[PDB]
Every structure is written in C-alpha cells, then in structure tokens.
C-alpha cells in the first residue's frame, strides 16, 4: 500500500526488535496464502535468518518457496490441530 518494509528499519534497530518488527510484518504477509499456518510459517522463516528474508521476500520463487516449505514441514507436527 505505502512505505513497504525496508532493511533500514532493522539497520537502525537492535537484534531483538528485528525479528519483532520483521516477523510482525511477515505474519500477515504470509496469511496471503496461509492465513492459518501463517504463525508457524513466519516463525521458522524468522528463525533461519531475518536478513535472508529481507532478500527473499523480494522474490516470488523465494516467498512461495519458503511458505510452501514451512507448511510442508508442519505436516509432521500438525496441520490445523485436527489430528
């Protein structure tokens, strides 16, 4: 919509606020395709390395790849807590 995420926001911030802001903004961004597993998805994706996400979120083959992978991983734990 306006004023999208920028590496600057994290550049002028601590190593804690990073995952906070980034993950917080990525939470909804993931819901675009997985509004259910958006949580776990953003969680693992935020663990690997926030920096990587700041460069992966700028690509379709990457974004969809991460989301898909994550969701696939949760397949072992639980999908919608209905098992």
């Amino acid at each position: 919509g306006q004023e999208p995420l920028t590496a600057s926001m994290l550049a002028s911030a601590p190593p804690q606020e990073q995952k906070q802001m980034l993950g917080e903004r990525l939470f909804p961004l993931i819901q675009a395709m997985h509004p259910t597993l958006a949580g776990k998805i953003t969680g693992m994706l935020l663990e690997i390395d926030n920096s990587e996400l700041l460069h992966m979120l700028e690509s379709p083959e990457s974004l969809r790849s991460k989301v898909d992978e994550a969701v696939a991983v949760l397949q072992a734990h639980q999908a919608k807590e209905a098992a």
Binding site: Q20, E24, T42, G43, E47, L74, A76
Partner: peptide, 19 residues
C-alpha cells in the same frame, strides 16, 4: 530452507503481545 526440509520445533518469535 537449507538442503530440503527444516525444523518445526523452531520457536516463533518475540511479538509485542502482552495483555
């Protein structure tokens, strides 16, 4: 994520939700 699959036990993050 790295080679094929990743860990699901990986904690989420540090949100700003208290109450």
């Amino acid at each position: 994520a790295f080679s094929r699959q990743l860990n699901v036990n990986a904690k989420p993050f540090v949100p700003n939700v208290h109450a």
